[PDB]
Amino acid sequence: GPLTRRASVGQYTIPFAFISEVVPGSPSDKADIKVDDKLISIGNVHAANHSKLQNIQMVVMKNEDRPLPVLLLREGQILKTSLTPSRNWNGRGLLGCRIQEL
C-alpha cells in the first residue's frame, strides 16, 4: 500500500482474498481483473465483513446487471475498478473468476 506521507490539504486497504483464475470474456475479465490480484473490497464486502467469503456470492447475485466497486491490490498498487455481474457471457456464473481466501 502507499507509504505514509505528511498530512495534506484535501477507503479499504486490507487484502482478504485472491484471484487464482479469470475466464476470458467474463465479467471479471471485463473489469480488468487479473490472476494474482488480491481483493480488498467488492461492493460493501471487505476484510472485516466478508463472512468467510459467503457475503460475496450474495452481493454479486443482488447486483446482477449493475456495476459494483472493486478495490484490489496488483503488484503492490491499490486499483479501483468496477465489475458488472452478469450471466450473458460464455461460461458459468456471474463472475468468471475464482476467489479464495488468503
Author numbering: 115 to 124, 129 to 220
Question: What did the published study say regarding this structure?
Answer:
The 26S proteasome is a 2.5 MDa protease dedicated to the degradation of ubiquitinated proteins in eukaryotes. The RP-specific chaperones Nas6, Nas2, Hsm3 and Rpn14 are important for the assembly of a hetero-hexameric AAA-ATPase ring formed by the subunits Rpt1 to Rpt6. One of these, Nas2, binds to the proteasomal AAA-ATPase subunit Rpt5. The PDZ domain of Nas2 binds to the C-terminal tail of Rpt5; however, it does not require the C-terminus of Rpt5 for binding.
Since no crystals were obtained, we created two truncated forms of Nas2 with the goal of minimizing the sequence around the PDZ domain. Nas2LND produced well diffracting crystals after two months, enabling us to determine a structure comprised of amino acids Gln129–Leu220 in the asymmetric unit. Nas2LND adopts a fold consisting of five β-sheets and two α-helices commonly found amongst PDZ-domain structures. N-terminal residues from cloning that spanned Gly115–Gly124 could be traced in the electron-density maps. However, residues between Gly124 and Gly129 were disordered and could not be modeled. Following refinement, recurring electron density was observed in two regions. The first was modeled as a disordered PEG 400 fragment obtained from the cryoprotectant. Nas2 lacks the GLGF motif commonly found just prior to β-strand 2 in PDZ domains. The absence is not surprising as the Nas2 structure shows that β-strand 5, instead of the common β-strand 2, contributes to the putative peptide-binding groove, causing a different loop arrangement. The reported Nas2 structure will provide the basis for further insights regarding the structure and function of Nas2 in proteasome assembly, as it will facilitate molecular docking of the tail of Rpt5 as well as enabling the design of Nas2 mutants based on the putative binding region.
